[PDB]
């Protein structure tokens, strides 16, 4: 039948890509990094503690000013903190009570939230009466929302559990382009610092590089053995790292199109929930379900001080744009800022 | 000049914590419930007893708040959004009493989940009358789906409603003990199940939920004091 020949030529394409990539691999990145000098131990304690949430924390996002951060909890509340004064700023109630994601505008004028309601809500913070109200609600996703990332003041990229990623358009309420390439629930995504390309990881153990300009799958990155729950870019923009539930963290290069290093350890067994990089890229962070976060190095596996300050499962974390300090989130409704 | 921003954020903080404690008083006094069922399980009747990806129904029973959440419009993938329900009071399970083995496999997965441990399960065996008539005529009996049904016997603690078929008591207790075999296996003393016998006309299912929720909170309070 036609399904047989289409499947057969599909496998032949997988082979010729793999053979071309295998011929492309000349020297593992571990070999070229054999002459580098390890940084050592950068063990550091927490600086600030943030309290005020009722239920577990699922997501957070940092601000461009590297001072404002917003988190979401199952109680139906959005809280924008102050990393310096520790004093809360805004308290946004939610119509639903099962939010599973959060975001932050590049200019600080917008936030995002989504969950089991299958509707992404955009809240405008710079209103005219000094209060907070929802600006636009986006409906059309069949499944729950899992990750949102603002590209600019007009368009937003949201990933839902309907196996499709969408590029919405505020002030219109309709989708512009849809990325129907995944065969599993999409968990997290991140955008490169050029508002042109972004990668998205789903529950099909594959991270796909999309293009918002044409709405097609530019490249596909594989290597993980379980569902991908975290993803982040290298500061240069030509590389990105992922994180799955198999206690493995891998580094991918947009030009190599294959895994380079696996930042895994035999002691860690729980899955990763959130990853991030440093300003210079000479570091690596990855959350875990064993109540603490590990610190690595991009050039080679160099275990630094473990950021162990949480009681429940770590579900979200981030790094400031200036790279001065980092933040972490956990299900104990507690947020800490490590520097 | 810089202190005014501080007192502004402090005043903004207190007015935020005031509303947080205001909503905490109703959040701690609300017993959220997860209404879960299978395809054509008859769970709509429970909703009517008193698009969007989830439904809500706020009903009070003797100054007690119960919040049921119905999963509507979500795909069959449950391994990701079932983790959000690790803080509810109980997960109401609806079965269409092979459409029965899948309910047992879904109950087993929820029971043995790593986050959904510590949450109890309220089981409702709906379609009790429809199942009773079909086993009475004998056109489609459940031995094809359960070969051990012949070797099963009526429990000593059976309470058959008078006039119920000698066969319906065998059927309702067999399905009841099927879920008990799963709950008692992984049960370490943190969450229990309360199977019930729900018909298509009985309106006392709301009273059953109140009694099970009372047992859940009582066992939780006993566990905090290490008494039980």
């Amino acid at each position, epitope marked *: 039948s036609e399904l047989d020949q289409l499947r057969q030529e599909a496998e032949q394409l997988k082979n010729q890509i793999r053979d071309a990539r295998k011929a492309c691999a000349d020297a593992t990145l571990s070999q070229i990094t054999n002459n580098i000098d390890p940084v050592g131990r950068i063990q550091m304690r927490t600086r600030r503690t943030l309290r005020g949430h009722l239920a577990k924390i699922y997501a957070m996002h940092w601000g461009t000013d590297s001072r404002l951060l917003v988190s979401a909890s199952q109680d139906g509340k959005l809280i924008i903190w102050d990393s310096y004064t520790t004093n809360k700023v805004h308290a946004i109630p939610l119509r639903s009570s099962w939010v599973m994601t959060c975001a932050y505008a590049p200019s600080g004028n917008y936030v995002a939230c989504g969950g089991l309601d299958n509707i992404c809500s955009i809240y405008n913070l710079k209103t005219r009466e000094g209060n907070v109200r929802v600006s636009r609600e986006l409906a059309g996703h069949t499944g729950y929302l899992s990750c949102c990332r603002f590209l600019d003041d007009n368009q937003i990229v949201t990933s839902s559990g309907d196996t499709t990623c969408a590029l919405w358009d505020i002030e219109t309420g309709q989708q512009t382009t849809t990325f129907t390439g995944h065969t599993g629930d999409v968990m997290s995504l991140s955008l490169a610092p050029d508002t042109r390309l972004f990668v998205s990881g789903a529950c099909d153990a594959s991270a796909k590089l999309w293009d918002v300009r044409e709405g097609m799958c530019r490249q596909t990155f594989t290597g993980h053995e379980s569902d991908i729950n975290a993803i982040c870019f290298f500061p240069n923009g030509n590389a990105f790292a992922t994180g799955s539930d198999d206690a493995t963290c891998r580094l991918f290069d947009l030009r190599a199109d294959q895994e380079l290093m696996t930042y895994s350890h035999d002691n860690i*067994i729980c899955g990763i929930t959130s990853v991030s990089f440093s300003k210079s890229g000479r570091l690596l962070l990855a959350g875990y379900d064993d109540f603490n976060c590990n610190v690595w190095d991009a050039l080679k596996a160099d275990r630094a001080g473990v950021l162990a300050g949480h009681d429940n499962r770590v579900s979200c974390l981030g790094v400031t744009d200036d790279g001065m300090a980092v933040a972490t989130g956990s299900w104990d409704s507690f947020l800490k800022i490590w520097n | 000049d810089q202190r005014n921003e501080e007192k502004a954020q402090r005043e903004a903080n207190k007015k935020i914590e005031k509303q947080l404690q205001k909503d905490k008083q109703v959040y701690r006094a609300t017993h959220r419930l997860l209404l879960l069922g299978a395809g054509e399980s008859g769970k709509n009747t429970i909703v009517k007893q008193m698009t969007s990806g989830i439904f809500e129904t706020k009903f009070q029973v003797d100054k007690v708040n119960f919040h049921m959440f119905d999963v509507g419009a979500q795909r*069959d993938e449950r391994r990701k959004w079932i983790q959000c329900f690790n803080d509810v009071t109980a997960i109401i399970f609806v079965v269409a009493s092979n459409r029965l083995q899948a309910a047992l496999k879904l109950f087993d997965s929820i029971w043995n989940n790593k986050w959904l441990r510590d949450t109890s399960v309220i089981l409702f065996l709906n379609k009790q009358d429809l199942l009773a008539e079909k086993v009475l005529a004998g056109k489609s009996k459940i031995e094809d789906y359960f070969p051990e049904f012949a070797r099963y016997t009526t429990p000593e603690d059976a309470t058959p409603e008078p006039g119920e078929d000698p066969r319906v008591t065998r059927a309702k207790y067999f399905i009841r003990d099927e879920f008990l075999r799963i709950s008692t296996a992984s049960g370490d003393g943190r969450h229990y199940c309360y199977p019930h016998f729900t018909c298509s006309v009985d309106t006392e299912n709301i009273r059953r939920v109140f009694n099970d929720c009372r047992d859940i909170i009582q066992r939780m309070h006993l566990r905090q004091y290490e008494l039980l």
Partner: nanobody
Framework: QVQLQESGGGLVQPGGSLRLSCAAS????????MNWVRQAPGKGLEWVSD????????SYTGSVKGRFTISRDNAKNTLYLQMNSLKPEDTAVYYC?????????????????????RGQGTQVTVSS
């Protein structure tokens, strides 16, 4: 690359035993709980069997608990499902599924209509 391919199957006479395979690659075969599902024509997916990591926890569907027999080989990274005396009720394509989260006693979404960690269907037609 996570991929599962199954073998065996075909037209079998009633009362004839048949065996199936499930070759797994791209991951650790020993650190996952593998399961089976069936898709009867004009019906939905139905769970058939499963097996734990080592092989201690093994369950089968009540509909055919006795005749079916499952086994796995962690060293060779291949799993085998043995079926004896096939009945007309078993004329369904069998898909090799794979539980996503490792080191878990539970397993969600085994019989979902659309699943990533699940191979193709091996047709097993039971007819005269």
């Amino acid at each position: 690359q996570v991929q599962l391919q199954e073998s065996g199957g075909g037209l079998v006479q009633p009362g004839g035993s048949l065996r199936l395979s499930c070759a797994a690659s791209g991951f650790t075969f020993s650190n996952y709980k593998m399961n089976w599902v069936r898709q009867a024509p004009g019906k939905g997916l139905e769970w058939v069997s499963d097996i734990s990591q080592s092989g201690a926890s093994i369950s089968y569907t009540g509909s055919v608990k006795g005749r079916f027999t499952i086994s796995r080989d962690n060293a060779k990274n291949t799993l085998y499902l043995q079926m004896n005396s096939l009945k007309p009720e078993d004329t369904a394509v069998y898909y090799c599924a794979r539980c996503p989260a490792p080191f878990t006693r539970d397993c969600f979404d085994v019989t979902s209509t659309t699943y990533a960690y699940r191979g193709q269907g091996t047709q097993v037609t039971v007819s005269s």
